Structures are given as C-alpha cells and as structure tokens.
C-alpha cells in the first residue's frame, strides 16, 4: 500500500502479563496509549497532550472486545498455542560515546512472540535498578513484536554493560554485551 | 512454555495524495484471519479460521456502512488534525566524527528520518569504502544513523562529513 | 482536539 504517512491503532490481549495493551503509532512511533490499570490516556511527549485528547474508554472497551474474540478463537482453534519466536537483541547508545557525558544506552529487542519478556540491565555483572526505562510492546507488520529498553548511564573507563533478555523462545537468558 | 493465547487487531490509515485508505485486521496468535479493506468495501477472510466471522459481519449492513465511512470519519479527521506536531515535526540532527583505521560519522537526534550523509576528502566526494547503517529508531521520536568510512590516512588530508536534512537551512559539516 | 477511533467487531 502506497502512503506518505501511516497512522495505526494497535492492541493485543493475552493470557500472561501484560494481559493487554492499547496504543496508537504514527509512522511506527508510539504516540499514546491507554493505561488499562489507571484508566487514563498517557502521551509519549507532553507536546501531544496539549494539542490532542483521546477518550480512555475507547481503548478500555476495545480491549474488552478483543478479550471476547480471544476466548472465541481459543475454542475455534482447538487451543492451538503459537510457537515461541526467538528475539533479536542489539545494544547501541543514543548519543556519541563520551567519558563524563550522561548518555542513554538503548537495548532493542525485536522479532519475538509472544509479548512476554523479562529484560534487565547489568553493569559490571551487577544489577542496575536506577535509570531504567522501557517502552511498550510495539507491533510489527509480520504480527511479531519489538520493544525498547533504556538505561541512563555516565560512561566510565572500565565499565561494561549487558542487556539480559529472558523469553520463552530462549533455553537460557540472552546476554547482549556493549562496551564501545 | 506455559499456556498462553493472544488476540490482536490493527486499524491502519494510509494517507497518500489526499486519499485515505483504511484497513482493519483481526489476528489470532500471529495469524491474520479476518480483514476489512476500504478499497475492497467489505470484510474478507484471510484464513479458513476467519470465514465464519467475515460472513456475519457482511450481514449487518449498517456496520458495512460504518466501516466504509472510516476513511473519511477517522483517517481524514486524524490526519488533518495532527498536522502541526507530526506531519511538520522537525528536530535538527547532531553530527560527530570520531577516528575509532575507520572514521565514523555519527548523526543523531533527527526526527524526519529522511537524511543524506555524504563523505568528502579534500573537497572531493568519496564513495568507495562507504558503509552506512540502516535508519535506527531510538523509540523516542528521534532517529539515528552511522556512516563509517575506511581511509588511507595521509598527514594533511581533511575528511569532512556533510549532512543534509529537511530541518536544516544549510547543510551541516564536521571535519577531521 | 478530540481524536477518532474505531470499534473492532465481535468474532462469533
């Protein structure tokens, strides 16, 4: 399909957590989503919230519609569970690497299914609970998913980082390394 | 592998030359079975799993009239409304050249995504040995690209990385 | 300001 700009509503409901998401992307960039727990509309950039507005019930009700379609398609398909697709992990910084300059490390998990992940940041082989931030489970054209994980870090000399990814398609957690 | 099943759907608006095309997909576990296309006009089955669902939807004629009005009621509405902050959003890129024998021109923090990154050696554009990466999405409405250039370094040579972008009045250049 | 969305149909 030929297009100059693509605006897509994406939503999914599953058995495990997260049991549901409702987002809207503009040119493959998540603009906003509906927090199914707080029942509010969360905008990506604050610029959008000042110029737009979305009814949170439009996402809440559509999630309920997909929940019915989930139970219906579970019976019609005779409880067929899809195969676990292996994720692809690549780590890269947001800005040019520089000592003392607070940068942001990006871990891009891609081409996986189902949307169930346990992603965690590791610095020098130790956990990093500070400066962690993640995106939603973003959709793809082949109906698989991709996700972003961020870590605000200050580059030092001998510091190396890792992106530990746990998925049902991996027999052991995957460690994607980055040092330069 | 614990027990888990998934249902998902899409509502896609394709804008091009003042036209709006709407597609509504119904997917079960990465398998699209039902689909509405505004160019088609009615619901269609993509798999045998979605044939009973498509026939029931083509019977409710008011819903077929609703889905046919989507390209004008939803796609054209959201397109003309979000114009300022999405259709015309500009973030100027930042260029950086590091030796890393390679030479990496790391362009960062540009949103429109369409960008040209050329190499120059003493004012002459170099093409051989240029290895550019794909458009990298940061996920924060900013893009990123890395164009590595291998070189035969000779003292006195000046390598310049030229970057042209829609958000820039004149091309930005950084030299090494 | 108000954006538009669409209702997914019930499969049955």
């Amino acid at each position, epitope marked *: 399909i030929k297009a100059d700009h693509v605006s897509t509503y994406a939503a999914f409901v599953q058995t495990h957590r997260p049991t549901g998401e409702f987002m809207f992307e503009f040119d493959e960039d998540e603009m906003f989503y509906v927090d199914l727990d707080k*029942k509010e509309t969360v905008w990506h950039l604050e610029e959008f919230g000042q110029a737009f507005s979305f*009814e949170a*019930q*439009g996402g*809440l*009700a*559509n999630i*309920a*519609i997909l929940n*019915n379609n989930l139970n219906t398609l579970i019976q019609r398909s005779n409880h067929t569970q899809a195969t676990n697709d292996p994720p692809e992990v690549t780590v890269f910084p947001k800005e040019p690497v520089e000592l003392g300059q607070p940068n942001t490390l990006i871990c891009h998990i891609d081409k996986f299914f189902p949307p169930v992940l346990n992603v965690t940041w590791l610095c020098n082989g130790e956990l990093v609970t500070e400066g962690v931030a993640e995106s939603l489970f973003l959709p793809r054209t082949d109906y698989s998913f991709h996700k972003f994980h961020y870590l605000t870090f200050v580059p030092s000399a001998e510091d190396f980082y890792d992106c530990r990814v746990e998925h049902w398609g991996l027999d052991q957690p995957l460690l994607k390394h980055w040092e330069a | 592998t614990p027990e888990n099943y998934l249902f998902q759907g899409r509502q896609e608006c394709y804008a091009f030359n003042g036209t709006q095309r709407f597609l509504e997909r119904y997917i079960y576990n990465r398998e699209e079975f039902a689909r509405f296309d505004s160019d088609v006009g009615e619901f269609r089955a993509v798999t045998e799993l979605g044939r009973p669902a498509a026939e029931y939807w083509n019977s*409710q*004629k*008011d*819903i077929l*009239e*609703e889905k046919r*009005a989507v390209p*004008d*009621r*939803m796609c*054209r*509405h959201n397109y*003309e409304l979000g114009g300022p902050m999405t259709l015309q959003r500009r973030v100027q890129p930042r260029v950086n050249v590091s030796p890393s024998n390679l030479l990496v021109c790391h362009v960062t923090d540009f949103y429109p995504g369409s960008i040209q990154v050329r190499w120059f050696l003493n004012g002459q554009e170099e093409t051989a040995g240029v290895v550019s990466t794909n458009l990298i999405r940061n996920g924060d409405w900013t893009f990123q690209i890395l164009v590595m250039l291998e070189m035969t370094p000779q003292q006195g040579d000046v390598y310049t990385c030229q970057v042209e972008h829609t958000s820039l009045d004149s091309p930005v250049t950084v030299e090494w | 300001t*108000g954006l*538009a*969305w*669409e*209702w*997914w*149909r*019930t499969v*049955y």
Partner: T-cell receptor
Amino acid sequence: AKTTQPISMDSYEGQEVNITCSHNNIATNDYITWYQQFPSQGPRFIIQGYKTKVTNEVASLFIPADRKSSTLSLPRVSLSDTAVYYCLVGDTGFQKLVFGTGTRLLVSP
Amino acid sequence: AVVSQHPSWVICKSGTSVKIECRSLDFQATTMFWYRQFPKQSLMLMATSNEGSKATYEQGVEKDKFLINHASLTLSTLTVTSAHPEDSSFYICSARDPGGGGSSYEQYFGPGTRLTVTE
C-alpha cells in the same frame, strides 16, 4: 454536540412526514443517529448515517453535503407512529450524547 | 442485543433504599447509561457508569443520593439511597454494544422502571 429539533409536529395519516434536525457545528468526527420513543417505554434506534443517504423499513435519512442538517423522512404515517423522535450527533465515545427535547410527532386521523 | 431492567414496578416509603438492576443478557458492556424521564417531560441522562471506575454523573444529580455500582461487565445497578416523593419518576437504563449489533452507537434501553415514593 447539542442538537435542535422542533418541539412537536402535526400530521395526517398517510402523509410523508419530514423532521429536520439542525446540527450546524458538526465535525468530521461525528455520526448521525436517530431514535424513536413510544409512550411508556424507552427510545429505540431506527436509522443512522454519515454523508450518504440511508433508507430502511422504518424511515429514510437525508444528509446534505455540508452535513449541517439531516431530515428524517418517515413514510406513509400510521397512528402507531405517534412517538417522540430524537436526533443525536456525536462520535464513537460515551461522552454526553445528550437526548434533547425530541419532536413529539402527532398523527391525527 | 437485549437489555433487562428489574424491577419494573416499585412502591416504597420515604427513606427506603431502592436498588435497580440493569443487565445485558447477550453482551458484555463496559459502560451503561442511566436515564430518568418525568410524567410529562423529556429524557434526562443521570449518570454514566464505567467498569471498575467512577461513574460520570451528569449535572444535577448527587452521588450520595444515587449510588451506582458497575459490578460486572454484565451488571450495572443504580440505588436510590433516600426515598422521597420527588424521586417518583420513570428510570430507564441503556447500554451500547460496539462489538455486536447493527450499530456501534445504538443504545439498547431496558424495559424501564416505574417508581413512586409515598410518605
């Protein structure tokens, strides 16, 4: 949005009745839906439309190009059609599709 | 899509609590509206209940006077806490079925509730 309708209408049996609804400040986002409420019961949906003209068993809906108004054309009216007819405009949400003072159509024999 | 509303007739003394059940028999709804019509006047939307959330009360009603509970996707109940002769009206409820039914906007009203409070 808030609509404006005639408070009541008079007619004779067998006459085509046209109820014009004025909704000037309509949007690309809104839809036109009509209801019918008989005495001692609640309203009931009868017809809807966006742009194009719609015709069903109960009535027809005429929508001009500007979409600032809509006419409900009930066919050959019978005394069983003496009811209140509501005109509602709004989007797919649930945000106050107010039921204004409908058109109390009276079909006198 | 059928909506049931019980009870259909209710008579009670002032101060009595009156619970009205508005059920969606063949569909599950996240929002179910509550209306009220007077013997000679027109319809008036009282409040809009949401599943697991707060009810969007319209202007004129008191949440401490009409307690509303959206217990399930099928059930939504309205409770007249303190009975008063002024509360005597015709209470109707509606519910939208965006996924099923001929229309996404069609509000399916219930049979109605005739209420009369006496001293």
